[PDB]
Every structure is written in structure tokens, then in C-alpha cells.
Amino acid sequence: HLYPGEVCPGMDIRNNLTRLHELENCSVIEGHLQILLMFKTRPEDFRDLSFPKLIMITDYLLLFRVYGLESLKDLFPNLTVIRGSRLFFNYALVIFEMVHLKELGLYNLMNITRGSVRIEKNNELCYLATIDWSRILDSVEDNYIVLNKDDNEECGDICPGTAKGKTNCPATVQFVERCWTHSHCQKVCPTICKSHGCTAEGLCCHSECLGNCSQPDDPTKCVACRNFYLDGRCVETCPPPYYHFQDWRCVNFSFCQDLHHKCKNSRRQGCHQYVIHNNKCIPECPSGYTMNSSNLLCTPCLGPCPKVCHLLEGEKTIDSVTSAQELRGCTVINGSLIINIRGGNNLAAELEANLGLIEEISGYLKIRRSYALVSLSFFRKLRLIRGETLEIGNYSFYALDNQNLRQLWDWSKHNLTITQGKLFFHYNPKLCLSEIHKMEEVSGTKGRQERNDIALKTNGDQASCENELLKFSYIRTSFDKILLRWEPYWPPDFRDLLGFMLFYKEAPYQNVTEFSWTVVDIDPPLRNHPGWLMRGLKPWTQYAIFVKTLVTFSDERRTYGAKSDIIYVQTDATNPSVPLDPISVSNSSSQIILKWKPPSDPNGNITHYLVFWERQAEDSELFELDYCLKGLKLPSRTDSQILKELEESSFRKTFEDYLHNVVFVHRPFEKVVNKESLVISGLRHFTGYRIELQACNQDTPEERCSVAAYVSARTMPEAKADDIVGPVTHEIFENNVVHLMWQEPKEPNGLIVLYEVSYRRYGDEELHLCVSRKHFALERGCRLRGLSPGNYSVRIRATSLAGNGSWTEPTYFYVTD
Amino acid sequence: HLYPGEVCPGMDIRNNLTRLHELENCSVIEGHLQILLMFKTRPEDFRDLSFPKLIMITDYLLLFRVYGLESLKDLFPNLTVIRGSRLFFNYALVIFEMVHLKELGLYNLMNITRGSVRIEKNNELCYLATIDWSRILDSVEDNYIVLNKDDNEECGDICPGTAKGKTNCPATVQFVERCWTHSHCQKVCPTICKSHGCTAEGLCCHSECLGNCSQPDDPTKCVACRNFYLDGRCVETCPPPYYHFQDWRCVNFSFCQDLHHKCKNSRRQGCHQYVIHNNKCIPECPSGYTMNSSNLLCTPCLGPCPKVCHLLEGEKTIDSVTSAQELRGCTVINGSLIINIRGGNNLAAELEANLGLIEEISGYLKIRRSYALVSLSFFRKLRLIRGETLEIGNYSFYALDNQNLRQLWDWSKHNLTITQGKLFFHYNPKLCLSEIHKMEEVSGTKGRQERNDIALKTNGDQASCENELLKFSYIRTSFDKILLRWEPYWPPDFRDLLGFMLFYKEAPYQNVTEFSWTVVDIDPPLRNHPGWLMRGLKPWTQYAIFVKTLVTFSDERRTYGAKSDIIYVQTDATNPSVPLDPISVSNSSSQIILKWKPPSDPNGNITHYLVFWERQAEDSELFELDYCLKGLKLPSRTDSQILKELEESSFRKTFEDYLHNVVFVHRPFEKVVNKESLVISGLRHFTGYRIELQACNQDTPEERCSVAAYVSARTMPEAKADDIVGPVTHEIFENNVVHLMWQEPKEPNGLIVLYEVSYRRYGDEELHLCVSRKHFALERGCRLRGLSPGNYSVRIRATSLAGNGSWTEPTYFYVTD
């Protein structure tokens, strides 16, 4: 009971109202309701149309360009709740371009479980601002209501009550009215119940009811079930032996089994092979599980487990990787496959990932005009071709007009078989007959092929199918060049040899398979080991080299020629480049940190670095030239943007190039090992130092390595070393000739630039005086003259390259009056 | 005189000082002086080295990593001016990474004509901040002086004068000294002369001297010539019969002629074929001119005129378009050409532009492993191959291992000949023997080719060389589909036919040459005109279709098969899409402008538009429902961003798709022709209008076209139409029953929502009152009661949907007391 009708799967009404009355009985839609493209329909047609039994909708509702529809108050008078199991572009209710629509009329919808509402292009619709979307939908932030008649202030939304003081329903927030139509207005239950709903008297329903109820506190009287529906009784969870189905109703095993039976054979278009798992009738077994036909339980399959991908009409054409995406993970293909890859990028890897798990093809495989393919290696696991379905002429393998196809599979490792039909190969220039004969002997189709089945004049013609072997004889290397030699091969008829080809490329690893190369041709020898010499190689790199002959195509038995094996050759090393960014920082009196970067061109492995730091004496003129005479200086020793960027970069690159073809051949030094930083200790304070830096790779056997990079730094001085020590003695010979004998700061910051002497009469002003190095040396101190007799005090300060010093303690001294 | 030595071309000193003394005599360098990579050099080596005669340098000066060089005061003691004719990376003086360098010493350089100075990485160089670059170089804004010993305050730059009051040279701007070394300091001439210079006494030189002079006002005593040098006499312009040479000196015809004689044969590396033009010995004739061997004048050559491009060692390999750029504009190639184009983009057009002007190849042409080439059409003007140089085997044309080569040239239009040697073709799958035989008959090489010269088994095998013709029999079109038929062709042996191929592509123009396509295969008929039906076409487009047979390669005489001619087929038209963005704007009482855009899918040519505008009556409830009762409303009728953008775009695209496969079949209207805008006239003021808009393409023969797009608008009202007209009459029946008989605004803005009446006692307050439509209709005016007797005035205002009106004139009226 609880539903007079059945459940109707969602449909797509279009272009005729005769399909709309299919809902004459059913009350719940376990699909989506879409009504669109209704042009000839007139408003008089909707006057006598209603679906009062429709209550529950699972997925969503869509309306688009339905002429003659004025309001839904009659179409869906009892639509209670939209479950929103599957959303339409993240929308559970879409109303788009609904001309002639005046008002919604959905006054019986209270709950929308998922999604938002998108109403747009409704130039006639009114009654939108009078809707409490907060009470209807839990999360209203995803709404979209624009370009309507209520966008501009034009809708006179009037709902019952105003003639009697605005009764029959309340307002909410500014306090604004909420109403659905001109006759029916929105109903809001008390907040004391979240979503169970309330009756007319306001009494709340049972916790299991959703939206509406008939008798308060009765799970058997709900109209909608919050969790699951069961024989007219809402329940939180379906007890055994019932399984939750479609997220809203509970079913027995028999129904799911019958649906699966329908889906096997008698359900072609998009049926779901329902299997029971985790007490849920899921449409399909999830990842890492398999379906067992006995009872349809998603048992965890061990390892790769079958995923049969039945093809539509038994034929699929793979043009690009996107078409292969739909086939991803399919191990067995129940049909025939066609490959027509004309172009793309980085193929044979994504294709291998998507299709490598294929293990069987029921029908036939056909490779046709696949220009970008180079090999069929991407069919990693392909083992057997059933070939139950055969093309015209009873063909199982069809290869045609492949330009770059060079091999099918490695037949020293791979196994394959074909049951029915015969092979076919035409217009495959780069595929020799050797693989075709491997197919006749391996696939067991030797007795099946007949005349004209395999083209003997268009397949093995332009291909490279050398069978003999070539051995390198003399190999020597160098820092730049490489000389190569091999045994002189001659075909049975010497006139049929055109020359050799040499291939080489950068080989960082050893995973080179020859499937991007530099080709160099070599003339035949004059009937003397033929060879070639390289010239443009980069030092200390591994190279992959192999030589292939080139023989003309005589009409007689093919002289297949010889191609050597792939070998790896490593170039020698040379002296590295200059280390980059040498920066020196002083943080102590004798500790200077040094930072740098590895050279841009190591040209080998950098075994050790080399740092030379030498003490630099101070400048000569700082000694014999005065710095306090009139006129001096304190020796305080401490697209245009893109175009200019390219110009500067090219200038720097030009100088780097100049540094790269130079053609190479008692100071305290330390060899840094595997470290890019170095500190120094035991240095004189505040002294200029010249730092020469080198990078090196070879140490013991006649060591030779890079050229030097220079940088300089000065250590931090000592604030104490410049202080004056010793009593300041005074002596006058005849007439106030003040001689000042006092010790010099024999440990200064570099040197003593000048002295300053200041003296002051008691209660009088102090007068200062300079003392130069030359004057101090010649006088062995300072000489003062023209001073009035009395008692004075002397303040002496010393200056160095660091800066001004500290005045000594004022030793007051009295000259006779 | 004026120069004891000759002029030395600029060189590149490197790795040994033995090349430096080559300047023992010459005094002017008409080149560039670069000294770099001097490692083993010691400072003692520079002690006894000087070049006092060097005065004038034309291009620039470069120093880089010259160990042992302390200062240039001895190297270049008389370098007066650097002309800077050709700059090094926009720098006329580069000093980079000069270790051991202390000071510049260039105290005799005054003028730098062009470029700036770049001094960088000089951790020892000082005397930089004491340089007046403004006086030296005219434009100093391009200087670059960083990362030196003067960047940090570490150089005590001291220059003579301080011991004697800073004399012997002045300062300039803060006022700062300018000096070159510790012994020689910069000399600045008085501003009264711009650049002619001054002597020791300050007297200015002649206007033609540059930098320095010996006797003031003497053009014959200058050291450098401002404009041009001539036999020790500076001159503004060289008079005839002398021509300006190298921008600084004048020469006779004999010298330029001898230089050209040296250049033609006995000058291999980079000589300039000097020709006299416009009184200048230019290195080469400019664009649009030619060289005549009689007198070497750049006469204007008529039309394409020869530009012979002699090749280095007679062999050039073209790998990419960049390699072809160097050959651009060359009409005759004196050498041999090799083509090895392996890849690229949009080839055969840029290559044709760069190389299409070639008219002759002296040596041989060789196309080898050119995988990306499709035809030799880019050799537009190639006519004759001289073939004086032949490879091994005496070959002139060498084509080898070309995968996509399909034709050489069209031999109904092109002409070609080859003098010496024989042809060669091997491993050209897509080139049939027909063109090779065309070559044997056209080039005149039929008698030269011998056995094994042309491969008969590896050229015309995989190619498409159909010779017969196919004629279409039945062709009919549709709006979407196309059905095609042709005459049933059968080869001589019916078993050798595999099927037909059909090609079609979008064909906007008719310049289709079949050289991007969609291929569809067709099975042979059952021995009944074979044909195909199309399904995925876009309406109203022109299609290029041609059918090519596919016949197996029998061992007997080739059944070449038949390919039809390229034909152009145009699909039918259908009803267009909806017009985009319909916007309506009101700017008058009856004028409303309308704007829109053409439909996105015209599906033909839009002959005319269709606009339907209908008057909409006002809402019904506005009449019978009061709007002034207690409780009312004034009817004031007026990466997540990327993901959401893609979601919205896909939603719109889904609805457009829904609109695209609909499968199609008395109002005042007007057909707009070839106009996207429309205005309307003669409309009631402030009335709702519904506008239905359509696009159309077919008019007379059973017209049918797009579906409607809707939009609505309202006209602007009249501020006068709402005014009240007519006297306001009053009458009291028994007891102050004030009846107000006055005319209604029978022409309102939509309708009269309500009236308001206000009356006031003399010197007292005014009280207002509403009047509803129903009350006004039933009372035929207003009724007033409960009013004290006396003299009053009435103010009446009318309201409409536009808004509040204007109160009428207060007509004071007296009721009996």
C-alpha cells in the first residue's frame, strides 16, 4: 500500500504530449523527469491534465521550452521531495527558458536532499522572491536565479491574507512573507523538529517520515521515508533478508536476481548487471571484486580478475587515445576491434597502459591505415584470437596500409594462436616476410593461407631485415672525437653494396631498444678496414652506436646484409668549467665563510676542490702620504626587457663559449672534498685576502683540472686592538715645548693612519691637533708650542682603517706658570 | 704622412704573446682589437712592451682574462678615439674579468663616437669613480660598471695635486675630481668648443680635428679626422675622384679595384667584394642593385637580378628552415646541395619562399632520407643542373630513402635539363616509375642510365599511380546526408580488386590539390552501381570528394586502377539557430530600440529577420484590489574558477545541442532586412510589450526558418498624462458630507492605482486621506465626514504605476459654520 501505482523509470518526453500520459498510474519516479521541446502545445491542452499521484522523484526535474505551460500547480500537486540521487550538472531542479510560465505552484515540496535549484530565462514567471529556499533546501549557497521577471521590480507577488491582515502563513527574514502561489502559500513547521515535518495542528511526525505525515508519531503513516521504504513502513535500515536498493527502498533477493536475469540477455540498452554486495544491490561489483554467478556476491578476486567488456554491435574503431580510454581495464573483448591511429603524441605507452590487459578477442583484429604505429607491442597480454566472427573472405588478422609498422611482437618471448580464419597483409612496407612466416608457423595458420592472401611484393620491400652480424674491430676514444672500425663485409656480388650507415645518440641509460637518431653515411671501401671518425661529441657521455649496411634490391635471392649489435661507448673526461657564484663573507676576526656552486660543465665527477687564499699587504701610499693635511679623504676601508635579457644572456653565453675551447695543457691551500662550502681560521684581523678557487676531478695520475676563479674579502677588525696602551709622558725643554712620549698601538687594524691630540685649560675650551705618521716618526711623539702656561689635560685618540678610536683617559698635567 | 705606419686589420690575439708584436709599425686599426686567454703571461713580460703609435681604432677593444696585465698606460699610450663602426654586443669597449689590472691608464682617449663602456668583474681595478664619462662618451646612459673594486669603498684613488692643493686638473659634478691614473689625470677642454679639442694653452683646434691637435686652427695638424682622412689633411667630404672608404678615409678607384681583384679569387675567407656606389666603396651592392664588372657600379637591376651564392667547399646540407635561411634570395648556387629535412612544421611554403628563386645548381642535387618532404614543388624556378661536379659513379640526381616523396614536379608545366651524370632513385616507396620515365625522356638522360642505376623494385610499389578515370553516376544531397554513386569499374581480373576508398574534407575554397582527409572504405559490389552514403556532415558547406580504387599488386602487368576527379559538393541548408543576446531599451514614450546578434549557426544566408511585438494588458488584480488599505505594497513597475567556467560552458553547450536536433517541420510585425537593430514607433506610453524575435533565410518558396527568441520591455511614461484636469467641485448634502466631483485622468500611465485628498483649516494642520478605485467608483468621487465647519482648502494628488503625481492647485472652499 501507501502508493496506488507502481514505480516508473524516468523518461524523456519530447515533441508530443501522447508520451506524457504514461504516468497514469505510477506514483514514484526512480529516474529523472525531463519535459522539453514542446512547441505546438497550447495552454488549453494543460487545462485537463494532472498527475496527483506523483509524490517521490529520485534524480531531478528538468523543463525547457514548453510552450503553453502556465503553472505546475496542477501538473505536480503532491511532489513532496526530490531525492537528488544523480544530479544534472550539479542541479536537482532545472527550469530553463520556460515561456508562458507564471508561477511555480509546487506548494507541496518541502525537502530537497541534494543539489541546488537553477531557474533562469523566465521573463513571465513570478513568485520567486516570496520563496524561503532556506527552509526548502539545506544548502542554498549554490542557487542560481537570474534573468527573470522578478529580477526587475515588475512582479506583483500577492498571496492570500492581505485582505484580512496577512494571515494563513507567517513571514521570516528583514521580515518578509513566504508564499508559493496566489492561492497556496508556503508551510513552515516549527523549528523544534528539523525535517520530520508537522501536521496541520503542528504536531511533529515520526523520526522516519520526511516532509509530510498523516498521524503524528507514526512510522507507518509517513508519506516519504527518510532512510528506506519498506511495505508502507519507513525504516532506518532494511533488516535481512532484504537489501537496500536504489538508496531509498528495500528489496528481496528474488527481485535483484530477476533484474540481473533481465540484464544478461533481454536488456540491450544500458541495463545494470545488479549484484548483491555489502547488503546493497549495487549496479556493479566495485573495484577489486568479482561476480560469481551462483549467488552474485562481490567476492574479492585474487589478482587480475575478469572484466568482460561487450562491444556495441561487435565493432569498435580506435582512432585516438580517448577512444582507448573507454576500453581501459578490459581483459576480454566480446567482439571485433579496429585500429585506425593516424596521429598523436607519446603513443605506445598510454595505449599500452589502457589496452595492455587485453587477453582475448572474440572476433577479428584489424589494423588499417595506422600511420603512427611502430609496433604492436602495446598489446602486452594478447594471447588468443577466438575469431568466431570473420570478415568477408573469412579473415581473422587484417593489416593494411601501415607505413611505420616494423614488427608485431617478439617471438622469442610472446605466444599467440588464432582459431578461425586466415591472415591478411598488404601495403606494409616496413615489415619483412620473416614475421609473416613466423605467423604461419606459430599461429598454426600455415595450412589456411592460400594464393593472394599475403602480398609477396608490397610487404618486405622497403624494410630493414638484415640477418647477418657485424663486429667492431678497432675502437678508440678521446675527449671529443671517437674513431670506429669494423670487419669489411662484402655481399656475394660486390656491385650490389651501396654503403654503410652509422647511428648514434645520447645514451644516459642502457634501456635503448632502437624503436631521435643521428645518421651518417659511409662509402664502401676500395676492395683496409672501413670506418668513421666522429667530431661533434660532448665529453664524458655514454653513446649508443650501431652500424647497418645498405644493399641494393637485386631481383635474385635477397642479400639481407648485416647490422651490428647496439654497443655503449663512453667519451673521455676533460677539465671542468669554472665554479659558479663564488661569494665570501666575514663573520669574525679570522673566520671567513666561502660559498660556491658546482661547475656547469663537470666533464666528469668532481673529486675535490682547490682553494688558494693569500694575504695581501696594505696599499703603499697609506704609509708615506699624510691623511690629515689640508685636503684629504678618510680611508674608510669597508619587449625591450625581453630583448635586453636575451642580449645579456647571449653576451654571457659568448664569453662562456670563449672559455670552453681554451684547449688546456707557496700559499696556504686546502683541498675540500665533496663540500661546496669552506671556512678559514688563523688569519690576521682586518687584512685584505685574495682567494683563488678551482674545481678538480683527477688527483693522482698526472692531475689536471679547471682554471681558477678569483674573489677577495677582508676580515672583521678588533675594537680592542686599536686602543692606546701606556702612560702619556710629557716634558718641556725650554718654553712650553710639550714632548709627548707614549707607546704606539703596535697591533692596529691594518695600520695607524693618524693620531689626534686634544688639550684643554681648566674651565676653558679644548683645542685639538692632528699628528701624521711622518711627523710622529720624526718627532717620536708630538710637539706642542705656543701654549699659555698653566694646568692642562690631554686627550689622545688613535685612528686606523676601521675608523675613529677611543680617546684615552685625560691625564691632567701642569706646566710651570 | 701623419702616420708612421700602415693600417692593420683587426686580429684575435690568444694564447701567445708572439702574435701581439704584429703591430710593430701600424698606427691605425681598421678592425677590432681583442686580447683574451693569456694565462702563462707574467707581469714582467709587459714591462718592456708598448705600442706608442696606436692612435685610431675603428670597431672596439676587448680584453678578457689576461693574467699579468697591470695597467694599459704603457700598452696604449696614445689611443685617441675609438670610432665604434661595428659594436660588440652594443659595446665599444669591453673589459671583462681582468685580474691583476690596477688602473686603466687610457689618459689620451677623449672621444668615443658610438656605443658605451662595459667594465665588469675587476676585483683589483681602481680609478673608476674618478672618470668623467660624460666628457668622454656623448651618451653615458648605456654604461655598465658593476662588481669591481670600486663598487665597495676600497680604493684610495689618489691622483696628483693633493700634496699641492689639488691642482693640475679641475673637478666637476657634487664637485668631484676627475683623473685617470696616479700620475696622469683627465684633461677637459673648455665648453666653448664641443669636440674639436684644445691645446695646452686652451686654444681650440680646427673644426675638422677630433680629440687632439698640435697647432690651433689648422686642419692639416689634426691627429684624428672628424669626418674623413685624406693625405694628412682632414676634410668634411672626399672630393672626386676619391670615394669614402670604411667611413673614415678616402681612397682612389685603383685601391678599391685592387681590393675587388684580391677578393674575387685570391681571398677565400670572408673578403668583401667592394663595389663603388653613391660615391662610397660599399662592401656589396645594396638591395635592388647589381654589380657590373666593367666599372663596379651598383646600377639598378631590372626585375630579379643575379645574386650568386658561392658555397663553402661546394657542399651544403639543409636540415631545417634555419639552414635554408642562409640561402634566401640566392638565384644561382655555385656548388652542390644536399637536402636532409627530417621534420618540421608548415614546410613547402617557407622553404619555397627561401629557395624558390634558385635557377641553377652548378654541382649536384641530392635528396637523402628526407622524411618530411612530400614533393619538390618548392624548387619553383629550378631549370638547369650544370652538374660540373659529380659524385662517385658520375651521378647528378640522388634520391634515397624518401618515405613521403610523392612527386617531383608537374611536367605539363615545368621544364628541366641535366648536362652531366646520370640519375639515381632507390627506396622511394611513394613515387611511381612514371615520373622516372618522364625524367629519362625530359632530362635527356635516357641514353645515360644503365643497369642498377634506377631501382625497379623499391620505387613504384607502395605508391598510388592510378591512370584510368572514374565518373560519378548518381549524386544527390540533403540537409545532413549525401548519397554518392559511380560507374562500376572492374579490373581485367576481377579477383584482384579489394575495394574502393572515399576521401572527403571541408572545402571552403576551391584551391584543393590533394597534397587532413577522412577515409572511408567500401567493399566491392557483388558482380548494381557501387556507392556510399554520408551521415556526419554539417549543413550548408562545400565538400571535396574523390574516390580512389584499391587493387592488389599482381606479379603481371600492373592494373593501375582508376581514381576519379576532385569534385565540390555543397550540402543543403536548414533553419538557423536562435539569435543571440536580444536586448531591448526604451528611450521615449513610444520609441524602443532593439539589439541582437546573428545566430551562431546560420545554416545558410540570413535573408531577413522577423520581429513580433504584442501589447500586453496590465495585471488584473491591479484593478479590483485596493492598494492603500492597512497593509499594502507600492506597485513600482520599473582552479575552481576554471572548473566552474567549464561546467557552465558545458551546461550551455548541452542545451544548445538539445536545441540543435529538434528536427523541425494577427500581431504588428515587420521584416528587418540586412540589419541587426530595429526601432518601433506608435506605442502606448508605459505599457508592457512582449517581443518575439526570429531569424529567417528562405522567403518565397515555402518559407521556413528558426525558432523564436523572446524578450520584453516597457515604454517610458509621460509626466504630463497623470496630471489632474478639471475643477474640483464640492457639495454638502446635510452635515459636512463633502462630495468631490472632479474628472479622472482618463489617460494614465497604465492605470490610476489610488487617489489621495488632503484638506487643511486656515492656520491649522493639513490632514490627508486615501481614495481607492472601488470607493471612488462607488461614490463617484470622495466622501468626507466628521469635519468641523469653516473655510478649508483641498489638495488632490493622483498616483499611477509610474509613481506619485502632482497635487492640484489648492482651491479654498468654505463650508457653512
Author numbering:
A (entry chain A), B (entry chain B): 1 to 173, 177 to 518, 528 to 539, 547 to 657, 689 to 715, 768 to 919
Paper passage:
To further investigate why IGF2 binds to IR-B with a lower affinity, we determined the cryo-EM structure of the ligand-free, apo-IR-B dimer, at 3.9 Å resolution. The overall structure of the IR-B dimer in the apo-state assumes a classical Λ-shape, similar to the crystal structure of apo-IR-A45. The two IR-B protomers tightly pack together primarily through the interaction between L1/L2 domains of one protomer and FnIII-2’/FnIII-1’ domains of the other. This Λ-shaped conformation imposes a distance of approximately 120 Å between the two membrane-proximal domains of the IR-B, indicating that this is the inactive form. Notably, the 12-residue extension in the C-terminus of α-CT of IR-B was not resolved in the cryo-EM map of apo-IR-B, presumably due to structural flexibility. Nevertheless, the residues immediately preceding the 12-residue extension in the C-terminal region of α-CT are well folded and form an extended loop in the structure of apo-IR-B. As a result, the α-CT motif in the apo-IR-B becomes longer as compared to that in the apo-IR-A, and thus can reach and contact the FnIII-2 domain of the same IR protomer through the interaction between Phe714 from α-CT and Asn594 from FnIII-2 domain. We, therefore, hypothesized that the additional structural restraint of the C-terminal part of α-CT imposed by the α-CT/FnIII-2 interaction in the apo-IR-B might hinder its threading into the C-loop of IGF2, thus largely reducing the association rate of IGF2 with IR-B. To test this idea, we introduced N594A, N594R, and N594E mutations into IR-B to disrupt the interface. Indeed, IR-B N594A, N594R, and N594E mutants exhibited increased IGF2- and insulin-dependent IR-B activation, when expressed in 293FT cells. These data suggest that the structural restraint of the C-terminal segment of α-CT by the α-CT/FnIII-2 interaction regulates ligand-dependent IR-B activation and explain the lower binding affinity of IGF2 to IR-B as compared to IR-A.
Insulin receptor (IR) is a receptor tyrosine kinase that plays critical roles in cellular signaling, growth, and metabolism. IR can be activated by two highly related ligands – insulin and insulin-like growth factor 2 (IGF2). Consequently, IR-B has an additional 12 amino acids at the C-terminal helix of the alpha subunit (α-CT), while IR-A lacks this segment. Here, we present cryo-EM structures of full-length human long isoform IR (IR-B) in both the inactive and IGF2-bound active states, and short isoform IR (IR-A) in the IGF2-bound active state.
